[PDB]
C-alpha cells in the first residue's frame, strides 16, 4: 500500500470498492463422483472447493463461476446409486435462470455466451473422486427484473451462509439489509 512504496493513488472512477450490480443470466451442470456418500454439506464443500485448483477456464468470470459452484453444491440432489451398496455414488445438479449479484470486485469485463467445462479430481482425505461443470455465465443487457442471486440457495441447507460461501473462496459481508454482497475472493484468487 501507500505505506510501503511511493505513488499508488487510486483511480477516482471507483474509489476502492464501489458497489454495483451486474445483471447476468447463467446455466449450470454439475456431477460429483465419490467413493463414499457425503455425510454432510461440509464434506461436499470440501470436495467441491478444489474444482479450480488448476484454473484453465475463463478468468473474467471466476467469482461468478465460484458462486455458481456454490449454488450447485447447495442443490446437489442424490441418485439411486447413492444407496447402501450399489456402486460409487454420483451426485448431480443443474440450475438455470437469471440473477444479479452485488459485488465490489471492480468493473467486470463484458461476458459472452460460451460454455466452459471443468474436470479435476479431489482428495479431501476420507473421500476421493472427480467433478464436472458446465458454466454459461453471460451478460444480460435487458431490463427485466431478476431475482437476487442469493435467493436461489434455499435456507433448508446452509445452516449459516457466511462461512459456506467462504469455503469456496468467497468473502461475504451482510449489509443488514438482507442482500449479501461479494467483497472479494480468497487471497490472490
Amino acid at each position: 500500500l501507500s505505506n510501503d512504496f511511493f505513488g499508488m493513488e487510486d483511480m477516482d472512477l471507483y474509489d476502492k470498492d464501489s458497489l454495483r450490480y451486474e445483471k447476468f443470466r447463467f446455466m449450470l451442470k454439475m456431477t460429483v463422483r465419490s467413493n463414499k456418500p457425503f455425510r454432510s454439506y461440509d464434506d461436499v464443500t470440501a470436495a467441491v472447493s478444489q474444482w479450480d485448483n488448476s484454473y484453465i477456464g475463463m478468468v473474467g468470470k471466476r467469482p461468478f463461476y465460484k458462486i455458481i459452484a456454490l449454488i450447485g453444491s447447495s442443490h446437489l440432489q442424490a441418485t439411486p446409486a447413492v444407496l447402501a451398496d450399489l456402486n460409487q455414488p454420483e451426485y448431480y445438479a443443474t440450475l438455470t435462470g437469471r440473477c444479479f449479484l452485488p459485488h465490489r470486485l471492480g468493473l467486470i469485463p463484458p461476458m459472452f455466451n460460451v460454455s466452459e467445462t471443468f474436470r479435476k479430481p479431489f482428495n479431501i482425505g476420507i473421500y476421493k473422486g472427480t467433478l464436472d461443470f458446465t458454466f454459461t455465465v453471460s451478460d444480460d443487457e435487458s431490463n427485466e427484473k431478476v431475482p437476487h442471486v442469493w435467493e436461489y440457495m434455499n435456507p433448508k441447507y446452509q445452516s449459516q451462509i457466511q462461512k459456506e460461501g467462504l469455503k469456496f473462496g468467497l468473502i461475504l459481508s451482510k449489509k443488514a439489509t438482507g442482500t449479501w454482497v461479494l467483497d472479494q475472493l480468497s487471497p490472490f484468487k
Binding site: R33, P80, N87, S115, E116, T117, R119, T130
Partner: protein
C-alpha cells in the same frame, strides 16, 4: 428424396446431442430386467437403453490430446473421460415398462452383456440368414471370450432386436460407444467395438467408395476429382465436399451423422449419391479390386476410360533426386502425335486422345466366379466381358 442435411447445420441448430434415458431404477434391477427380457424375447427398448447407460459409466480412459469436434469441448489431453461424456444426457419423459425383473444375477454384466446388446444391433441389420448366423456365431465367440459360459439369451429366432435400430436413443448410445472405443483403441473393454463398428461411417457408402477409388488408382484425391464427368458426378462430388463438414478428421462426429441424428438424410449415402458410387465401384472392379464385386447397382464409358488410363499407362516417374539430375530427355524423338495410348495420367491429355479397352475390360472381369444379384460384379460381367 429428402434434402441433404449436414452435421454442421445440426450443430449450428443445437450445441449438444441430447440422450433421452430413464434412470429411475437401480443397476441390478435393470440387469435382471434386460437379462430376463433377452431370455424370454420380451425386453423393452427403454429398459435396454437405461441398462446400457447404467453399465457403461466407465470414466476410465485418459485422453492424451485435445478431442474437439464441430466446436464441442469434449476433452483436453489428460482428463479422464467416459463413454457418455461426449453426448448430452437428459431425462426421458415417458412410461417405464413393467418388466420381468430378476434377482439371482450377480455383478457379471459389465464384462459381456453390453457386448451382447451392442452386437445384436449389428446383427439385426443384415436380413441374410447366412450372414446373420455368421455374425451371431462371431458374437457368441466374442462374449465367450470373457465369461466363457454365455448361454445364448435371445432364442434361435424371434428377432426382437431388429426394431432396436428404429429407436433414436439406442442408436445414439451405440454410436457414442463406438466413438469412445475408437478414440481409445487399447482400452480393456475395447471388445465392445464388435456390433457397434457398423455405426462407423453408417449410410456413407459413397464416401467409402470414394476412398476405395483413391486407394486403388494410386492417384491423389486432388487428381481423381479432376476426372469427374457426366455432369451429375460433378455436382455430386461438389455436394459431397462441403468445407465445414470435417470429413477428414477421424475423431469427429461426422461418421455418426445419422446414428446421433445429426442428419435425417445422409449426403454421403448411396440412395442420395447413386451415380458416383456406381462409377467408383465399376472403376475399382476394372482395376482388380475384390471390394468392388458386391455393391448394389444404383458412367460406364467414363469408368472404362479412367480404368484404361490408370491400369495400362504406368507412371514410373523420377520423384527423388540427389540434388540435381532430375529431368527426362525431351530431345530424344519425344513425339506426341501417334495412334497409341498417351502413356500418362493427365485428364486433358487422355480426353484429347479419346477425341483394346474392350479386351482390357474382358481380362479385368473374366473368370469372376461366384457373383451375386444386383452387384457391380454381375453388371461388369454381363456388360464389360
Amino acid at each position: 428424396e429428402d434434402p441433404v442435411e449436414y452435421p454442421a447445420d445440426y450443430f449450428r441448430k443445437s450445441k449438444e446431442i441430447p440422450l433421452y434415458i430413464n434412470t429411475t431404477k437401480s443397476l441390478s434391477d435393470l440387469r435382471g430386467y434386460v437379462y430376463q427380457g433377452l431370455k424370454s424375447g420380451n425386453v423393452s427398448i427403454i429398459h435396454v437403453n437405461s441398462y446400457l447407460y447404467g453399465a457403461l459409466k466407465d470414466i476410465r480412459g485418459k485422453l492424451d490430446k485435445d478431442w474437439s469436434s464441430f466446436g464441442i469441448n469434449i476433452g483436453k489431453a489428460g482428463d479422464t473421460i467416459g463413454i457418455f461424456d461426449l453426448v448430452s444426457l437428459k431425462a426421458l419423459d415417458g412410461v417405464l415398462p413393467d418388466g420381468v425383473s430378476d434377482a439371482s444375477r450377480t455383478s457379471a454384466d459389465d464384462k459381456w452383456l453390453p457386448l451382447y446388446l451392442l452386437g445384436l444391433y449389428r446383427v439385426g441389420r443384415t436380413q441374410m440368414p447366412e450372414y446373420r448366423k455368421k455374425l451371431m456365431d462371431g458374437l457368441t465367440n466374442q462374449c465367450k471370450m470373457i465369461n466363457e459360459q454365455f448361454e445364448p439369451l435371445v432364442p434361435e429366432g424371434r428377432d426382437i432386436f431388429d426394431v432396436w435400430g428404429n429407436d433414436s436413443n439406442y442408436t445414439k448410445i451405440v454410436a457414442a460407444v463406438d466413438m469412445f472405443f475408437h478414440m481409445f483403441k487399447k482400452h480393456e473393454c475395447a471388445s465392445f467395438r464388435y456390433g457397434t463398428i457398423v455405426s462407423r461411417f453408417k449410410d456413407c457408402a459413397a464416401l467409402a467408395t470414394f476412398g476405395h477409388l483413391c486407394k486403388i488408382t494410386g492417384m491423389s484425391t486432388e487428381d481423381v476429382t479432376t476426372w469427374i464427368l457426366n455432369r451429375e458426378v460433378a455436382d455430386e462430388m461438389v455436394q459431397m465436399m462441403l468445407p465445414g463438414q470435417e470429413i477428414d478428421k477421424a475423431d469427429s462426429y461426422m461418421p455418426y451423422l445419422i446414428d446421433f441424428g445429426l442428419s435425417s438424410k445422409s449426403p454421403y449415402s448411396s440412395v442420395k449419391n447413386p451415380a458416383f458410387h456406381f462409377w467408383g465401384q465399376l472403376t475399382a472392379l476394372l482395376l482388380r479390386s475384390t471390394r468392388a464385386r458386391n455393391a448394389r447397382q444404383p458412367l460406364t464409358t467414363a469408368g472404362l476410360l479412367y480404368a484404361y488410363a490408370v491400369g495400362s499407362s504406368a507412371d514410373l516417374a523420377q520423384q527423388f533426386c540427389v540434388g540435381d539430375n532430375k529431368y527426362t530427355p525431351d530431345d530424344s524423338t519425344g513425339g506426341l502425335t501417334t495412334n497409341a495410348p498417351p502413356q500418362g495420367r493427365d485428364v486433358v491429355e487422355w480426353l484429347g486422345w479419346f477425341e483394346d479397352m474392350m479386351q482390357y475390360a474382358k481380362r479385368a472381369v473374366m473368370s469372376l466366379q461366384g457373383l451375386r444379384e444386383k452387384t457391380i460384379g454381375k453388371y461388369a460381367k454381363s456388360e464389360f466381358d
